[PDB]
Motif scaffolding. Structure first.
Motif, PDB file in Angstrom:
ATOM      1  N   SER A 129      26.797  32.134  29.213  1.00 46.15           N
ATOM      2  CA  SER A 129      27.373  31.360  30.143  1.00 46.15           C
ATOM      3  C   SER A 129      27.440  31.726  31.589  1.00 46.15           C
ATOM      4  O   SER A 129      27.669  31.244  32.511  1.00 46.15           O
ATOM      5  CB  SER A 129      28.682  31.031  29.503  1.00 46.15           C
ATOM      6  N   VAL A 130      27.437  33.238  31.609  1.00 41.34           N
ATOM      7  CA  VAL A 130      27.440  34.015  32.989  1.00 41.34           C
ATOM      8  C   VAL A 130      26.234  34.816  33.261  1.00 41.34           C
ATOM      9  O   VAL A 130      26.031  35.380  34.250  1.00 41.34           O
ATOM     10  CB  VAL A 130      28.733  34.761  33.142  1.00 41.34           C
ATOM     11  N   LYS A 131      25.196  34.738  32.242  1.00 36.86           N
ATOM     12  CA  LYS A 131      23.962  35.371  32.632  1.00 36.86           C
ATOM     13  C   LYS A 131      23.235  34.674  33.817  1.00 36.86           C
ATOM     14  O   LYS A 131      22.722  35.413  34.361  1.00 36.86           O
ATOM     15  CB  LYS A 131      22.960  35.205  31.335  1.00 36.86           C
ATOM     16  N   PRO A 168      36.393  30.684  30.773  1.00 38.47           N
ATOM     17  CA  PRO A 168      36.935  30.562  32.339  1.00 38.47           C
ATOM     18  C   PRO A 168      36.891  29.339  32.774  1.00 38.47           C
ATOM     19  O   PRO A 168      37.739  28.745  33.281  1.00 38.47           O
ATOM     20  CB  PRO A 168      36.095  31.530  33.189  1.00 38.47           C
ATOM     21  N   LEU A 169      35.701  28.438  32.708  1.00 40.30           N
ATOM     22  CA  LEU A 169      35.169  27.199  33.031  1.00 40.30           C
ATOM     23  C   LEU A 169      35.352  26.849  34.496  1.00 40.30           C
ATOM     24  O   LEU A 169      34.995  25.850  34.704  1.00 40.30           O
ATOM     25  CB  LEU A 169      36.234  26.230  31.927  1.00 40.30           C
ATOM     26  N   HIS A 170      35.925  27.680  35.385  1.00 35.91           N
ATOM     27  CA  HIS A 170      35.949  27.500  36.712  1.00 35.91           C
ATOM     28  C   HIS A 170      35.719  28.892  37.339  1.00 35.91           C
ATOM     29  O   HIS A 170      35.289  28.963  38.395  1.00 35.91           O
ATOM     30  CB  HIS A 170      37.057  26.523  37.273  1.00 35.91           C
ATOM     31  N   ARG A 171      36.420  29.742  36.781  1.00 38.20           N
ATOM     32  CA  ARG A 171      36.333  31.139  37.379  1.00 38.20           C
ATOM     33  C   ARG A 171      35.131  31.959  37.300  1.00 38.20           C
ATOM     34  O   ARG A 171      34.686  32.856  38.194  1.00 38.20           O
ATOM     35  CB  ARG A 171      37.540  32.082  36.917  1.00 38.20           C
ATOM     36  N   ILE A 176      31.725  35.881  39.442  1.00 33.55           N
ATOM     37  CA  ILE A 176      30.916  36.949  38.943  1.00 33.55           C
ATOM     38  C   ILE A 176      29.662  37.101  39.699  1.00 33.55           C
ATOM     39  O   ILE A 176      29.341  38.304  39.894  1.00 33.55           O
ATOM     40  CB  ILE A 176      30.682  36.697  37.426  1.00 33.55           C
ATOM     41  N   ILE A 177      29.366  36.035  40.538  1.00 29.26           N
ATOM     42  CA  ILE A 177      28.176  36.225  41.501  1.00 29.26           C
ATOM     43  C   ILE A 177      28.455  37.158  42.815  1.00 29.26           C
ATOM     44  O   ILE A 177      27.783  38.280  42.975  1.00 29.26           O
ATOM     45  CB  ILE A 177      27.688  34.801  42.126  1.00 29.26           C
TER      46      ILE A 177
END
Lengths: 195, 46
Positions: A129-131, A168-171, A176-177
Motif C-alpha cells: 500500500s505504501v510501496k 492509515p488511508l490518508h496519512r 511516507i513520500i
C-alpha cells in the motif's frame, strides 16, 4: 562543448536578442556516489509518529550500474526473468532477485532499490500500500540531490524493516513520500559520500 | 593596437582551475568576452 556554446552565444546576440550579456567562466555539472556499505542505520518517522522506514546504503557494482544505463536490466518484463538476468550475470541472490522495486531519477537510472526483511515482510498487504509511495519519494529524491542538487550515481538503497501503522488511508502515502526522501538523505549522507 | 571603445562574477563563486589563457578570446570570441562589438569570425581549421 566549447564551439557549440560559442556558436549559440553568437546566435543569441546577433539573431534574436541584441542585448549585451554578462557571461561567467563555464563550469561542468557534477554527480555523487557511495563506495561502501552503510553504518548503524537510521530509521525516521513522520511528524505524527505513525510510520518508519529502515534503509541502508551499499553500492551496486560498476557493471550493474552501466548495464541499467544500457536498459538491459529493465524491470518492464516479468520479475522472474529479471531475477534470472541478475542470476546469470552477477551471481545475485534469488531472495533479493524477486524483491526489487524501482530504479531512480528517470525511467533508467544509476540507482536500485532492494527489500530483504524476510520475517517482517510477511505483512505484504500493508507494505504494498505504501510501496508506490516509497517509489514516488525514491525517484524524486534521487533526482533532487542532497549536497548541491546534482544527481546520484551508483548507490544501492536497501530496506531492512518496514514499520507502518494499521490502516492509515490518508496519512500513509502522503507522509511516507517525504519520509522516504529523508531516509534516502540519511542513508546517503551517513557513511561515505563522494563526488 | 589602440582601444576601439576608448554579484555575478564573485571571486568566491568561481573555480579558477586553469588560468584563462588570453588566446581563448581570439579562438572563441563570444564565449570568452563580454560585449564583442565589431568582432570578426575566424576560419579555424583546414
Amino acid at each position: 562543448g566549447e564551439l557549440y556554446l560559442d556558436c549559440v552565444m553568437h546566435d543569441l546576440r546577433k539573431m534574436y536578442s541584441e542585448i549585451d550579456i554578462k557571461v561567467a567562466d563555464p563550469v561542468v555539472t557534477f554527480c555523487e556516489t557511495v563506495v561502501e556499505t552503510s553504518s548503524l542505520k537510521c530509521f525516521a518517522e513522520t511528524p505524527n509518529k505513525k510510520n518508519k522506514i529502515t534503509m541502508i546504503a551499499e553500492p551496486l557494482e560498476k557493471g550493474l550500474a552501466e548495464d541499467i544505463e544500457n536498459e538491459v536490466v529493465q524491470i518492464t518484463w516479468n520479475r522472474k526473468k529479471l531475477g534470472e538476468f541478475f542470476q546469470t550475470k552477477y551471481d545475485w541472490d534469488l531472495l533479493a532477485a524477486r524483491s526489487i522495486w524501482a530504479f531512480g531519477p528517470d525511467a533508467t537510472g544509476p540507482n536500485i532499490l532492494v527489500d530483504d526483511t524476510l520475517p517482517s515482510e510477511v505483512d505484504k498487504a500493508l507494505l504494498g500500500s505504501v510501496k508506490d509511495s516509497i517509489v514516488q519519494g525514491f525517484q524524486w529524491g534521487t533526482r533532487e540531490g542532497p549536497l548541491c542538487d546534482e544527481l546520484i550515481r551508483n548507490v544501492k538503497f536497501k530496506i531492512l524493516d518496514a514499520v507502518v501503522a494499521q490502516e492509515p488511508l490518508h496519512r500513509g502515502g502522503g507522509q511516507i513520500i517525504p519520509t522516504a526522501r529523508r531516509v534516502v538523505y540519511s542513508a546517503f549522507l551517513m557513511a561515505t559520500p563522494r563526488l | 593596437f589602440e582601444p576601439l571603445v576608448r554579484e555575478f562574477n564573485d571571486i568566491n563563486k568561481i573555480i579558477i582551475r586553469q588560468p584563462i589563457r588570453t588566446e581563448y578570446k581570439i579562438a572563441f570570441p563570444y564565449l570568452y568576452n563580454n560585449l564583442p562589438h565589431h568582432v570578426h569570425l575566424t576560419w579555424y581549421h583546414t
